[PDB]
Amino acid sequence: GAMGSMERASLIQKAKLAEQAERYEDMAAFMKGAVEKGEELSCEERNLLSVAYKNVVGGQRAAWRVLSSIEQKSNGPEVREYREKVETELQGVCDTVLGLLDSHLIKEAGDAESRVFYLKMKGDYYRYLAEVATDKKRIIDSARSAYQEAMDISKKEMPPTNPIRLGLALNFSVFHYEIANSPEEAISLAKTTFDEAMADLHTLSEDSYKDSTLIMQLLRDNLTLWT
Amino acid sequence: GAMGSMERASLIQKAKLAEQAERYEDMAAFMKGAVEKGEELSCEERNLLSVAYKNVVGGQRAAWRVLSSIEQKSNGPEVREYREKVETELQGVCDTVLGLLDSHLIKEAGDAESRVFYLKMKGDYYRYLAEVATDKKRIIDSARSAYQEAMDISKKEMPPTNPIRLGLALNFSVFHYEIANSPEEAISLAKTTFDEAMADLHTLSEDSYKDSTLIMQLLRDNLTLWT
Amino acid sequence: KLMFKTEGPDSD
Amino acid sequence: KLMFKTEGPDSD
Ligand SMILES: N=C(N)c1ccc(-c2ccccc2)s1
Ligand SMILES: N=C(N)c1ccc(-c2ccccc2)s1
Ligand SMILES: [Ca+2]
Ligand SMILES: [Ca+2]
Ligand SMILES: [Mg+2]
Ligand SMILES: [Mg+2]
Ligand SMILES: [Mg+2]
Ligand SMILES: [Mg+2]
């Protein structure tokens, strides 16, 4: 790509600068270029990749929902055309991230912390595709499959307070609630995840305790809205 | 351009949708395409053009300042390279807007409300160029020249409460303060503008009064920081 | 749409 | 940088 001539270390340094400048499209392009160097990513670098694309796709999702809402109220071609333009761009960003995971981040990820991180991402980006899908069943099953593999590994290999495990369960619970139309599964998962984390907090340092309880508060926030 | 095949009315409708979706790069591209149809713009359409590009260049200015600050603290090539990348993109957006004004918005603008609007924009986009310039004297003079022509017309043709006249004087006062290094001129202009508007408020409807006093509060905010 | 809490930047 | 008030969207 356009980043082929830049050093890996320079792409990572510029991803960090772009984050400070709130230049998330640049941050994502620099991190795509770092991934395409073909070396595995460190924990910090995986987090830069995820923050970059989460910010980009989050702008697109927010724009898509505004346009879809206008379109639904309206029922000329312009609202549909413009919602389709934003949808196509969102789908492209999802396919780009899914392409990086499949070529070749997941297959080289052997540690639980990396493997679960990337499989969680794969579920998340299929979930974003599912949000705009009307193909839809197969997209939902792809999200479910990725989340389930990440959950199976996380349960075997990580303590229940592990923030990656917690963030996975959070996102899988929202998948259940509003993509799979399984609100009871969503509530059961969020409750079991919170309760098993609560019981392991005694094992943590002050800093690990802060990281785990921040995500546990997100599970509680959802449970409050769902019950 | 890429908007050559879309109806003018469709570009304007989609600029309005893009604004609702906070898609300002799309809003600016749709408004550039509307301008390139070659018809004069209405008051509403001039405001869509200005809001779109103001939002785009504002992200770039904010990013440039973050990077310049890091660069100045740092004194490898990466901070300078990335600040230059963002600077070049900002310069391109300024040249695009200046190109629309010169081809051919200003020369066809005969009414004071349109003519002063576009000349104010020309001053503003030369001011954004001046903020990153290190050529700099000629860029400053271009901004000054555009602002002065807009001020001369506004003083002859518009009441002192006219919001376009007020916004012009506000921006010209900030030009003086921090681009021309003329803080006394900045303060004199902001004070005279506020006082002459104050004395004309009695002539306004409730709605016109709200529009004028909103901008007068910006002149006061600057005067509070400058004195 | 009411959006539920998901992991990481609340960027939407 | 302390930015002063200018016209329109405070987008920076
Ligand atoms: N938004 C960001 N720049 C980061 C998130 C997480 C980071 C991390 C740093 C050291 C070790 C493991 C993760 S950096
Ligand atoms: N941000 C926006 N969409 C607008 C600003 C000013 C507008 C206007 C509307 C009717 C007449 C004159 C101006 S629309
Ligand atoms: Ca379109
Ligand atoms: Ca660069
Ligand atoms: Mg579609
Ligand atoms: Mg330069
Ligand atoms: Mg959200
Ligand atoms: Mg500002």
Short mmCIF file of C-alpha atoms and ligand atoms in Angstrom, two decimals:
data_model
loop_
_atom_site.label_atom_id
_atom_site.label_comp_id
_atom_site.label_asym_id
_atom_site.label_seq_id
_atom_site.Cartn_x
_atom_site.Cartn_y
_atom_site.Cartn_z
CA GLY A 1 0.00 0.00 0.00
CA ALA A 2 0.87 3.73 0.27
CA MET A 3 2.64 2.81 3.58
CA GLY A 4 4.93 0.20 1.97
CA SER A 5 7.96 2.57 1.90
CA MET A 6 7.65 3.72 5.58
CA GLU A 7 9.51 1.95 8.44
CA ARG A 8 7.31 -0.12 10.80
CA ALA A 9 8.61 1.89 13.82
CA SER A 10 7.79 5.20 11.98
CA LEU A 11 4.20 4.00 11.18
CA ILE A 12 3.69 3.14 14.92
CA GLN A 13 5.16 6.50 16.04
CA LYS A 14 2.84 8.34 13.56
CA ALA A 15 -0.22 6.23 14.67
CA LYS A 16 0.49 7.58 18.23
CA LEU A 17 0.82 11.19 16.93
CA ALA A 18 -2.42 10.80 14.87
CA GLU A 19 -4.24 9.60 18.03
CA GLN A 20 -3.03 12.76 19.90
CA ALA A 21 -4.25 14.92 16.94
CA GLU A 22 -7.65 13.05 16.81
CA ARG A 23 -6.75 12.08 13.18
CA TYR A 24 -8.28 8.58 13.35
CA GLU A 25 -8.44 7.93 9.57
CA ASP A 26 -4.66 8.64 9.46
CA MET A 27 -4.15 6.53 12.66
CA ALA A 28 -5.95 3.56 10.96
CA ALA A 29 -3.98 3.91 7.70
CA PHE A 30 -0.64 3.96 9.66
CA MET A 31 -1.72 0.88 11.70
CA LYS A 32 -2.88 -0.98 8.53
CA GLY A 33 0.59 -0.24 7.09
CA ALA A 34 2.24 -1.56 10.31
CA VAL A 35 0.16 -4.80 10.14
CA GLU A 36 1.10 -5.28 6.43
CA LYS A 37 4.82 -5.37 7.43
CA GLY A 38 3.87 -8.99 8.36
CA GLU A 39 5.31 -9.07 11.94
CA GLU A 40 2.99 -9.93 14.88
CA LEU A 41 1.71 -6.92 16.90
CA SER A 42 2.58 -6.18 20.53
CA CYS A 43 -0.22 -5.57 23.11
CA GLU A 44 0.19 -1.76 22.71
CA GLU A 45 0.16 -2.06 18.87
CA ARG A 46 -3.01 -4.26 18.92
CA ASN A 47 -4.65 -1.56 21.06
CA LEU A 48 -3.56 1.18 18.57
CA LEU A 49 -5.06 -0.86 15.69
CA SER A 50 -8.35 -1.38 17.54
CA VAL A 51 -8.69 2.28 18.79
CA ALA A 52 -8.00 3.60 15.26
CA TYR A 53 -10.62 1.52 13.45
CA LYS A 54 -13.14 1.76 16.33
CA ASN A 55 -13.04 5.58 15.98
CA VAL A 56 -13.36 5.45 12.16
CA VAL A 57 -16.24 2.91 12.07
CA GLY A 58 -17.93 4.73 15.02
CA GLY A 59 -18.25 7.96 12.97
CA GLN A 60 -19.73 5.91 10.07
CA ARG A 61 -22.19 4.01 12.34
CA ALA A 62 -23.38 7.29 13.91
CA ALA A 63 -23.83 8.84 10.41
CA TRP A 64 -25.59 5.68 9.09
CA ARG A 65 -28.12 5.72 11.97
CA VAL A 66 -28.97 9.44 11.41
CA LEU A 67 -29.53 8.76 7.64
CA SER A 68 -31.48 5.48 8.19
CA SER A 69 -33.77 7.33 10.65
CA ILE A 70 -34.43 10.12 8.10
CA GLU A 71 -34.98 7.45 5.39
CA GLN A 72 -37.48 5.49 7.58
CA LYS A 73 -39.39 8.78 8.36
CA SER A 74 -39.43 9.61 4.57
CA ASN A 75 -41.26 6.19 4.05
CA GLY A 76 -36.79 11.55 -4.37
CA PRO A 77 -33.91 9.04 -4.24
CA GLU A 78 -31.35 11.28 -2.44
CA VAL A 79 -31.83 10.06 1.21
CA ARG A 80 -31.55 6.37 0.10
CA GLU A 81 -28.58 7.17 -2.22
CA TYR A 82 -26.67 9.01 0.55
CA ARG A 83 -27.47 6.36 3.22
CA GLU A 84 -26.19 3.74 0.70
CA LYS A 85 -22.98 5.79 0.11
CA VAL A 86 -22.23 5.90 3.88
CA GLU A 87 -23.26 2.19 4.25
CA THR A 88 -20.84 1.17 1.43
CA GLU A 89 -17.95 3.13 3.07
CA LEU A 90 -18.73 1.49 6.48
CA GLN A 91 -18.82 -1.98 4.81
CA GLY A 92 -15.45 -1.19 3.20
CA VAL A 93 -13.82 -0.31 6.58
CA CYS A 94 -15.29 -3.55 8.09
CA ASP A 95 -13.95 -5.64 5.13
CA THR A 96 -10.52 -3.94 5.47
CA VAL A 97 -10.28 -4.85 9.21
CA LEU A 98 -11.62 -8.41 8.56
CA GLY A 99 -9.00 -8.68 5.76
CA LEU A 100 -6.15 -7.78 8.17
CA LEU A 101 -7.40 -10.31 10.73
CA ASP A 102 -7.63 -13.07 8.08
CA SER A 103 -4.35 -12.06 6.38
CA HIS A 104 -2.70 -12.98 8.69
CA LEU A 105 -3.16 -11.71 12.27
CA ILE A 106 -5.39 -14.50 13.63
CA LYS A 107 -3.51 -17.47 12.11
CA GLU A 108 -0.18 -16.23 13.67
CA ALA A 109 -1.73 -15.37 17.09
CA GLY A 110 -0.93 -18.25 19.49
CA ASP A 111 -1.09 -16.47 22.87
CA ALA A 112 -4.55 -16.21 24.44
CA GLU A 113 -4.27 -12.41 24.94
CA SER A 114 -3.57 -11.87 21.22
CA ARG A 115 -5.80 -14.66 19.85
CA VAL A 116 -8.88 -13.61 21.92
CA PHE A 117 -8.22 -9.92 21.10
CA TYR A 118 -8.27 -10.57 17.31
CA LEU A 119 -11.25 -12.99 17.45
CA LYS A 120 -13.21 -10.43 19.51
CA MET A 121 -12.36 -7.85 16.75
CA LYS A 122 -13.58 -10.31 14.07
CA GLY A 123 -16.92 -10.67 15.95
CA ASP A 124 -17.18 -6.86 16.40
CA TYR A 125 -16.62 -6.08 12.67
CA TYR A 126 -19.14 -8.77 11.55
CA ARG A 127 -21.52 -7.22 14.15
CA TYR A 128 -21.07 -3.76 12.50
CA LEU A 129 -21.82 -5.41 9.12
CA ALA A 130 -24.91 -7.10 10.66
CA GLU A 131 -26.20 -3.69 11.93
CA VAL A 132 -26.64 -2.52 8.25
CA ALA A 133 -27.40 -5.95 6.67
CA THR A 134 -30.77 -6.72 4.96
CA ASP A 135 -26.64 -12.28 3.46
CA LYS A 136 -27.78 -11.06 6.93
CA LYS A 137 -28.12 -14.56 8.54
CA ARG A 138 -24.67 -15.68 7.35
CA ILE A 139 -23.17 -12.34 8.60
CA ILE A 140 -24.77 -12.87 12.07
CA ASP A 141 -23.46 -16.47 12.16
CA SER A 142 -19.91 -15.22 11.28
CA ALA A 143 -20.08 -12.76 14.23
CA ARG A 144 -21.46 -15.49 16.55
CA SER A 145 -18.77 -17.97 15.46
CA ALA A 146 -15.86 -15.55 16.09
CA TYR A 147 -17.27 -14.46 19.50
CA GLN A 148 -17.85 -18.11 20.56
CA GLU A 149 -14.26 -19.19 19.65
CA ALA A 150 -12.89 -16.13 21.56
CA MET A 151 -15.17 -17.00 24.56
CA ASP A 152 -14.07 -20.67 24.61
CA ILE A 153 -10.35 -19.66 24.64
CA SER A 154 -10.91 -16.87 27.20
CA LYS A 155 -12.71 -19.22 29.63
CA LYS A 156 -9.87 -21.82 29.42
CA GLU A 157 -6.87 -19.44 29.40
CA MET A 158 -7.73 -16.15 31.19
CA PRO A 159 -8.96 -15.26 34.70
CA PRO A 160 -12.52 -13.93 34.91
CA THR A 161 -11.26 -10.35 35.66
CA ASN A 162 -9.02 -10.27 32.50
CA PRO A 163 -10.10 -7.00 30.76
CA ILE A 164 -9.95 -8.61 27.27
CA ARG A 165 -12.21 -11.45 28.51
CA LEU A 166 -14.57 -8.83 30.11
CA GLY A 167 -14.73 -6.66 26.98
CA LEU A 168 -15.42 -9.74 24.87
CA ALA A 169 -18.29 -10.85 27.10
CA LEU A 170 -19.71 -7.29 27.13
CA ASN A 171 -19.71 -7.15 23.30
CA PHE A 172 -20.99 -10.74 22.88
CA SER A 173 -23.85 -9.88 25.32
CA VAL A 174 -24.84 -6.85 23.14
CA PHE A 175 -24.58 -9.09 20.02
CA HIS A 176 -27.11 -11.44 21.72
CA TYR A 177 -29.43 -8.61 22.82
CA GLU A 178 -29.90 -6.65 19.61
CA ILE A 179 -28.37 -8.66 16.71
CA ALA A 180 -29.38 -12.26 17.60
CA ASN A 181 -32.68 -11.05 19.23
CA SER A 182 -31.74 -13.19 22.30
CA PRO A 183 -32.23 -10.73 25.19
CA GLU A 184 -32.34 -13.55 27.78
CA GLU A 185 -28.96 -14.91 26.60
CA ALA A 186 -27.58 -11.30 26.71
CA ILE A 187 -28.76 -10.79 30.33
CA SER A 188 -27.50 -14.27 31.49
CA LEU A 189 -24.09 -13.68 29.95
CA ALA A 190 -23.75 -10.12 31.40
CA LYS A 191 -24.82 -11.34 34.91
CA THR A 192 -22.56 -14.47 35.03
CA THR A 193 -19.63 -12.40 33.65
CA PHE A 194 -20.11 -9.65 36.30
CA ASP A 195 -20.55 -12.14 39.21
CA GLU A 196 -17.50 -14.28 38.25
CA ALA A 197 -15.37 -11.13 37.87
CA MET A 198 -16.62 -9.75 41.27
CA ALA A 199 -15.41 -12.96 42.98
CA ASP A 200 -11.87 -12.71 41.43
CA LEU A 201 -11.27 -8.96 42.21
CA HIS A 202 -9.58 -9.90 45.54
CA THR A 203 -6.61 -11.35 43.52
CA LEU A 204 -5.81 -7.99 41.78
CA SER A 205 -3.46 -5.06 42.36
CA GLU A 206 -5.03 -1.58 42.68
CA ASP A 207 -4.19 -0.84 38.98
CA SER A 208 -5.63 -4.20 37.69
CA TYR A 209 -8.70 -3.64 39.94
CA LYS A 210 -9.35 -0.25 38.22
CA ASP A 211 -9.01 -1.82 34.70
CA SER A 212 -11.45 -4.73 35.54
CA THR A 213 -14.08 -2.64 37.44
CA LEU A 214 -14.26 -0.05 34.57
CA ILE A 215 -15.53 -2.81 32.22
CA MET A 216 -17.69 -4.43 34.94
CA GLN A 217 -19.48 -1.02 35.23
CA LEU A 218 -20.33 -1.30 31.48
CA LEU A 219 -21.93 -4.77 32.05
CA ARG A 220 -23.91 -3.23 34.98
CA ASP A 221 -24.97 -0.22 32.83
CA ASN A 222 -26.41 -2.62 30.20
CA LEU A 223 -28.07 -4.85 32.85
CA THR A 224 -29.76 -1.69 34.33
CA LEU A 225 -31.28 -0.83 30.90
CA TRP A 226 -32.21 -4.51 30.12
CA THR A 227 -33.93 -5.32 33.47
CA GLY B 1 -15.51 16.72 -10.69
CA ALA B 2 -17.02 13.53 -9.19
CA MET B 3 -20.21 15.63 -8.59
CA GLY B 4 -20.59 16.65 -12.26
CA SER B 5 -23.35 14.05 -12.93
CA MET B 6 -25.50 14.95 -9.84
CA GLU B 7 -28.33 17.53 -10.00
CA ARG B 8 -27.64 20.86 -8.22
CA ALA B 9 -30.81 20.41 -6.08
CA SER B 10 -29.66 16.83 -5.13
CA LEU B 11 -26.15 18.10 -4.10
CA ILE B 12 -27.82 20.78 -1.84
CA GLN B 13 -30.24 18.21 -0.34
CA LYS B 14 -27.28 15.83 0.37
CA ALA B 15 -25.16 18.72 1.85
CA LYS B 16 -28.06 19.21 4.35
CA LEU B 17 -28.20 15.44 5.11
CA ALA B 18 -24.37 15.33 5.53
CA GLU B 19 -24.60 18.25 8.03
CA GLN B 20 -27.23 16.26 10.06
CA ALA B 21 -24.90 13.18 9.97
CA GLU B 22 -21.82 15.32 10.98
CA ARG B 23 -20.20 14.18 7.67
CA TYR B 24 -18.47 17.52 6.95
CA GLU B 25 -15.99 16.23 4.31
CA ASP B 26 -19.02 14.90 2.36
CA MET B 27 -20.94 18.18 3.05
CA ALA B 28 -17.98 20.19 1.57
CA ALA B 29 -17.66 17.92 -1.51
CA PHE B 30 -21.45 18.25 -2.21
CA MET B 31 -21.26 22.07 -1.80
CA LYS B 32 -18.13 22.29 -4.05
CA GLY B 33 -20.13 20.33 -6.65
CA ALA B 34 -23.11 22.75 -6.24
CA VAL B 35 -20.79 25.79 -6.72
CA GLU B 36 -19.25 24.19 -9.87
CA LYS B 37 -22.74 24.10 -11.49
CA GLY B 38 -21.89 27.81 -12.12
CA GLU B 39 -25.13 29.39 -10.73
CA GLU B 40 -24.91 32.00 -7.92
CA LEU B 41 -25.64 30.66 -4.39
CA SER B 42 -28.61 31.67 -2.23
CA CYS B 43 -28.05 32.93 1.37
CA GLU B 44 -28.82 29.42 2.75
CA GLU B 45 -26.46 27.79 0.18
CA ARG B 46 -23.61 30.25 1.01
CA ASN B 47 -24.07 29.30 4.67
CA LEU B 48 -23.95 25.54 3.81
CA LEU B 49 -20.69 26.12 1.85
CA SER B 50 -19.12 28.07 4.72
CA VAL B 51 -20.24 25.64 7.53
CA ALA B 52 -18.93 22.64 5.53
CA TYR B 53 -15.43 23.99 4.91
CA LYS B 54 -15.20 25.66 8.35
CA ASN B 55 -15.76 22.23 9.95
CA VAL B 56 -13.22 20.51 7.66
CA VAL B 57 -10.44 23.13 8.06
CA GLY B 58 -11.20 23.35 11.83
CA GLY B 59 -10.30 19.65 12.31
CA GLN B 60 -7.07 20.22 10.33
CA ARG B 61 -6.13 23.41 12.30
CA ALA B 62 -6.72 21.61 15.62
CA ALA B 63 -4.57 18.63 14.43
CA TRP B 64 -1.84 20.98 13.07
CA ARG B 65 -1.56 22.83 16.42
CA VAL B 66 -1.24 19.54 18.41
CA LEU B 67 1.56 18.35 16.01
CA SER B 68 3.35 21.76 15.90
CA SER B 69 3.36 21.82 19.73
CA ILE B 70 4.89 18.30 19.88
CA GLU B 71 7.41 19.33 17.17
CA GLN B 72 8.43 22.53 19.08
CA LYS B 73 8.87 20.47 22.33
CA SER B 74 11.00 17.89 20.35
CA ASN B 75 13.36 20.87 19.42
CA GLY B 76 13.88 11.34 14.07
CA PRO B 77 11.99 13.02 11.20
CA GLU B 78 8.51 11.54 11.94
CA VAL B 79 6.94 14.48 13.94
CA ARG B 80 8.05 17.02 11.24
CA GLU B 81 6.95 14.66 8.40
CA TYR B 82 3.47 14.13 9.94
CA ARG B 83 3.00 17.84 10.80
CA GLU B 84 3.96 18.59 7.14
CA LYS B 85 1.41 15.98 5.88
CA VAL B 86 -1.42 17.62 7.88
CA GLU B 87 -0.17 21.13 6.89
CA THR B 88 -0.21 20.18 3.16
CA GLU B 89 -3.80 18.80 3.46
CA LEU B 90 -4.92 22.03 5.27
CA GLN B 91 -3.24 24.16 2.55
CA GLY B 92 -5.07 22.09 -0.08
CA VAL B 93 -8.51 22.72 1.53
CA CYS B 94 -7.67 26.49 1.76
CA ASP B 95 -6.59 26.56 -1.95
CA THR B 96 -9.80 24.67 -2.92
CA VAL B 97 -12.03 27.25 -1.14
CA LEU B 98 -9.96 30.19 -2.52
CA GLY B 99 -10.31 28.57 -5.99
CA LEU B 100 -14.13 28.48 -5.70
CA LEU B 101 -14.22 32.13 -4.59
CA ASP B 102 -11.97 33.21 -7.49
CA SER B 103 -13.72 30.92 -10.02
CA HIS B 104 -16.22 32.54 -9.99
CA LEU B 105 -18.21 33.32 -6.81
CA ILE B 106 -16.76 36.76 -6.01
CA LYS B 107 -16.81 38.20 -9.55
CA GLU B 108 -20.57 37.32 -9.92
CA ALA B 109 -21.53 38.56 -6.41
CA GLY B 110 -23.07 42.05 -6.78
CA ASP B 111 -25.26 42.24 -3.67
CA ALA B 112 -23.53 43.42 -0.48
CA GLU B 113 -24.73 40.38 1.54
CA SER B 114 -23.17 37.96 -0.96
CA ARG B 115 -20.10 40.05 -1.89
CA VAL B 116 -19.10 40.74 1.77
CA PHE B 117 -19.79 37.07 2.68
CA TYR B 118 -17.39 35.76 -0.02
CA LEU B 119 -14.70 38.42 0.64
CA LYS B 120 -14.85 37.61 4.38
CA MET B 121 -14.34 33.90 3.40
CA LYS B 122 -11.35 34.89 1.21
CA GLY B 123 -9.78 36.72 4.20
CA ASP B 124 -10.53 33.75 6.53
CA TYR B 125 -8.89 31.14 4.21
CA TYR B 126 -5.77 33.33 3.66
CA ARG B 127 -5.72 33.73 7.49
CA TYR B 128 -5.71 29.89 7.88
CA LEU B 129 -2.82 29.75 5.38
CA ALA B 130 -1.01 32.51 7.35
CA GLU B 131 -1.36 30.46 10.60
CA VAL B 132 0.96 27.73 9.11
CA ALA B 133 3.11 30.00 6.86
CA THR B 134 6.90 30.42 7.39
CA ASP B 135 5.55 33.66 1.23
CA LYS B 136 4.16 34.55 4.72
CA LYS B 137 4.11 38.38 4.21
CA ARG B 138 2.30 38.12 0.86
CA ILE B 139 -0.22 35.63 2.41
CA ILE B 140 -0.92 38.08 5.30
CA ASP B 141 -1.35 40.95 2.80
CA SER B 142 -3.85 38.82 0.76
CA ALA B 143 -5.91 38.22 3.95
CA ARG B 144 -5.71 41.94 4.89
CA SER B 145 -6.73 43.02 1.37
CA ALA B 146 -9.82 40.76 1.25
CA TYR B 147 -10.93 41.76 4.79
CA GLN B 148 -10.45 45.50 4.00
CA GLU B 149 -12.53 45.32 0.75
CA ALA B 150 -15.29 43.42 2.68
CA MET B 151 -15.12 46.05 5.50
CA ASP B 152 -15.35 49.00 3.06
CA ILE B 153 -18.48 47.49 1.38
CA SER B 154 -20.06 46.48 4.71
CA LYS B 155 -19.66 50.01 6.16
CA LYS B 156 -21.30 51.60 3.06
CA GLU B 157 -24.07 49.03 2.45
CA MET B 158 -25.05 47.28 5.72
CA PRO B 159 -26.33 48.48 9.12
CA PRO B 160 -23.89 48.08 12.02
CA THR B 161 -25.97 45.18 13.52
CA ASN B 162 -25.87 43.15 10.23
CA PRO B 163 -24.57 39.71 11.38
CA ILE B 164 -22.33 39.32 8.28
CA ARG B 165 -20.78 42.76 9.00
CA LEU B 166 -20.36 41.75 12.71
CA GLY B 167 -18.76 38.38 11.89
CA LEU B 168 -16.41 40.08 9.43
CA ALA B 169 -15.29 42.64 12.01
CA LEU B 170 -14.83 39.88 14.63
CA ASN B 171 -12.58 37.86 12.27
CA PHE B 172 -10.68 40.95 10.98
CA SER B 173 -10.04 41.93 14.66
CA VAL B 174 -8.52 38.45 15.35
CA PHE B 175 -6.46 38.77 12.11
CA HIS B 176 -5.06 42.06 13.53
CA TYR B 177 -4.40 40.62 17.00
CA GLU B 178 -2.48 37.45 16.21
CA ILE B 179 -1.60 37.45 12.47
CA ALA B 180 -0.69 41.13 11.85
CA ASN B 181 0.72 41.50 15.45
CA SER B 182 -1.46 44.67 15.77
CA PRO B 183 -3.23 44.09 19.12
CA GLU B 184 -4.18 47.79 19.44
CA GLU B 185 -5.88 47.76 16.01
CA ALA B 186 -7.68 44.50 17.05
CA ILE B 187 -8.99 46.06 20.30
CA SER B 188 -10.04 49.37 18.56
CA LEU B 189 -11.91 47.49 15.85
CA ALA B 190 -13.68 45.12 18.34
CA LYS B 191 -14.70 48.09 20.60
CA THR B 192 -15.99 50.41 17.78
CA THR B 193 -17.84 47.44 16.19
CA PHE B 194 -19.53 46.50 19.52
CA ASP B 195 -20.47 50.13 20.40
CA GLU B 196 -21.90 50.93 16.92
CA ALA B 197 -23.91 47.68 16.98
CA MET B 198 -25.19 48.42 20.56
CA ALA B 199 -26.58 51.77 19.35
CA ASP B 200 -28.49 50.16 16.38
CA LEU B 201 -30.10 47.24 18.38
CA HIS B 202 -33.23 49.39 19.02
CA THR B 203 -34.10 49.09 15.26
CA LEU B 204 -34.30 45.23 15.34
CA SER B 205 -37.01 42.61 15.77
CA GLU B 206 -36.60 40.08 18.62
CA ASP B 207 -35.19 37.47 16.14
CA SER B 208 -32.69 39.96 14.51
CA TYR B 209 -31.72 41.14 18.04
CA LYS B 210 -30.80 37.52 19.01
CA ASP B 211 -28.69 37.06 15.80
CA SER B 212 -26.76 40.38 16.34
CA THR B 213 -26.20 40.02 20.14
CA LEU B 214 -24.81 36.43 19.70
CA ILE B 215 -21.93 37.85 17.60
CA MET B 216 -21.56 40.95 19.80
CA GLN B 217 -20.93 38.51 22.74
CA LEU B 218 -17.99 37.05 20.72
CA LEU B 219 -16.45 40.58 20.32
CA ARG B 220 -16.91 41.07 24.12
CA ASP B 221 -15.34 37.63 24.87
CA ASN B 222 -12.22 38.63 22.86
CA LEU B 223 -12.09 42.14 24.43
CA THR B 224 -12.22 40.49 27.93
CA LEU B 225 -9.14 38.33 27.08
CA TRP B 226 -7.29 41.24 25.32
CA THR B 227 -7.78 43.89 28.07
CA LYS C 1 -31.32 4.45 18.45
CA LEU C 2 -30.55 3.65 22.12
CA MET C 3 -26.96 2.21 21.81
CA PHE C 4 -25.83 -0.21 24.61
CA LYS C 5 -22.29 -0.11 26.15
CA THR C 6 -19.65 -1.86 24.15
CA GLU C 7 -15.96 -2.05 24.69
CA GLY C 8 -13.49 0.76 23.89
CA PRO C 9 -14.00 4.26 22.38
CA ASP C 10 -17.68 5.38 22.38
CA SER C 11 -16.97 6.92 18.93
CA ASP C 12 -20.58 6.64 17.57
CA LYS D 1 -2.67 27.69 21.81
CA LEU D 2 -5.32 30.05 23.29
CA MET D 3 -7.69 30.48 20.25
CA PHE D 4 -9.80 33.72 20.16
CA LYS D 5 -13.51 33.76 19.09
CA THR D 6 -14.08 33.77 15.39
CA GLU D 7 -17.26 33.55 13.45
CA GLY D 8 -19.23 30.32 12.87
CA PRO D 9 -18.57 26.69 13.94
CA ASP D 10 -15.88 26.39 16.67
CA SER D 11 -14.67 23.25 14.82
CA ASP D 12 -10.97 23.47 15.96
N1 LIG E 1 -5.00 4.28 22.98
C1 LIG E 1 -3.82 3.84 23.20
N2 LIG E 1 -2.73 4.54 22.63
C2 LIG E 1 -3.41 2.61 24.06
C3 LIG E 1 -4.21 1.65 24.65
C4 LIG E 1 -3.53 0.62 25.34
C5 LIG E 1 -2.15 0.70 25.37
C6 LIG E 1 -1.20 -0.16 25.97
C7 LIG E 1 0.05 0.34 26.40
C8 LIG E 1 1.01 -0.48 26.97
C9 LIG E 1 0.74 -1.84 27.10
C10 LIG E 1 -0.49 -2.35 26.67
C11 LIG E 1 -1.46 -1.53 26.11
S1 LIG E 1 -1.76 2.15 24.44
N1 LIG E 2 -25.98 25.35 8.99
C1 LIG E 2 -26.96 25.62 8.21
N2 LIG E 2 -27.61 24.54 7.55
C2 LIG E 2 -27.57 27.02 7.90
C3 LIG E 2 -27.12 28.27 8.28
C4 LIG E 2 -27.88 29.37 7.81
C5 LIG E 2 -29.00 29.06 7.05
C6 LIG E 2 -29.94 29.93 6.44
C7 LIG E 2 -31.27 29.48 6.22
C8 LIG E 2 -32.22 30.29 5.60
C9 LIG E 2 -31.83 31.56 5.18
C10 LIG E 2 -30.52 32.00 5.38
C11 LIG E 2 -29.58 31.21 6.00
S1 LIG E 2 -29.01 27.30 6.94
CA CA E 3 -24.55 10.12 -2.55
CA CA E 4 3.45 11.26 7.26
MG MG E 5 -26.26 -1.35 0.47
MG MG E 6 5.06 22.82 4.52
MG MG E 7 -21.65 3.82 21.23
MG MG E 8 -11.80 27.86 17.53
#
